Amino acid sequence: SMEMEKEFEQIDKSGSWAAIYQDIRHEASDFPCRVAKLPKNKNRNRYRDVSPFDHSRIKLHQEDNDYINASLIKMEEAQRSYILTQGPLPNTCGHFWEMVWEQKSRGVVMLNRVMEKGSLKCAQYWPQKEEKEMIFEDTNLKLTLISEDIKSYYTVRQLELENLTTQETREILHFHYTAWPDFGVPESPASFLNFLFKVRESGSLSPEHGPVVVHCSAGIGRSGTFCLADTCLLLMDKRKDPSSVDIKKVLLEMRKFRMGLIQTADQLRFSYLAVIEGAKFIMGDSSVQDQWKELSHE
Numbered sequence: 001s002m003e004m005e006k007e008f009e010q011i012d013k014s015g016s017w018a019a020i021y022q023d024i025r026h027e028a029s030d031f032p033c034r035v036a037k038l039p040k041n042k043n044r045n046r047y048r049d050v051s052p053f054d055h056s057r058i059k060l061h062q063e064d065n066d067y068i069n070a071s072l073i074k075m076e077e078a079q080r081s082y083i084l085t086q087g088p089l090p091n092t093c094g095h096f097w098e099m100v101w102e103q104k105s106r107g108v109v110m111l112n113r114v115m116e117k118g119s120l121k122c123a124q125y126w127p128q129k130e131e132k133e134m135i136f137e138d139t140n141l142k143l144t145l146i147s148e149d150i151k152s153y154y155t156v157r158q159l160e161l162e163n164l165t166t167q168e169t170r171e172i173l174h175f176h177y178t179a180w181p182d183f184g185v186p187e188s189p190a191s192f193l194n195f196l197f198k199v200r201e202s203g204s205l206s207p208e209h210g211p212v213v214v215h216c217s218a219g220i221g222r223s224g225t226f227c228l229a230d231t232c233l234l235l236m237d238k239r240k241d242p243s244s245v246d247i248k249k250v251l252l253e254m255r256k257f258r259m260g261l262i263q264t265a266d267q268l269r270f271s272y273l274a275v276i277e278g279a280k281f282i283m284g285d286s287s288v289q290d291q292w293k294e295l296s297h298e
Ligand SMILES: O=C(O)C(=O)Nc1sc2c(c1C(=O)O)CCNC2
Pocket: 047, 049, 050, 112, 121, 182, 183, 216, 217, 218, 219, 220, 221, 222, 223, 263
């Protein structure tokens, strides 16, 4: 029916997802990451092969060291921005919340678990109990769990972030997709889309706020899948025209701002599936959102 559906079926028939995905890797932008590779920043990076480009990196408003492994993905035509970052390290959780503060983000999207495949993919950067708030002494921020709503494959938390210097406080929404394997895919397009539209419905993507912060362990694989689907749905929505959306071109545009977005060919295949199914809602069938909520078994 849609032009991306036709392409999807042709790629499936010819079994060429791996070759399509490798073409994207071959054509993807390459820009320098000199700040990331400075010896003083070695312990601020989780993975030595995952670095922010200098031209798009988020700078901390600190005179000491402004480096965080985070990139501003600025989608000009779609008119949506995202900050993609790695899962914070035990020594960078203060930097992480400093970035959320300085960038005026309303939401944090977390697509991984703290422990995956027997390893620590992300530091425990938010408080798990209301009565045990966290204080980040290096960046002078306080973080309190206000409430949380646990569902079968995601959790939403309300956090309070306080600048202890000025005593201003902000409510941060934490959207935690808990059933997405590292280097894997979500269990259905339905559950992925149900989650994405929860983030959308919260207002956290509004241009009145700073860019939403999106992370997985590296800030590229699952994070890239999430952002590609959202931007493609937004572009389709802006024009009310599925055919104007070239998913591979959009992914290449995003990769001008951070390397390695979408880490497997199956994640690329999955993001086609999410966009194709999300298109039903965009183009005026709001009952599919109800089917997602049911099929996902919240
Ligand atoms: O968390 C993700 O979805 C993601 O992109 N993970 C990535 S990308 C990436 C790695 C990982 C990892 O978690 O081990 C290891 C080193 N190579 C690149």
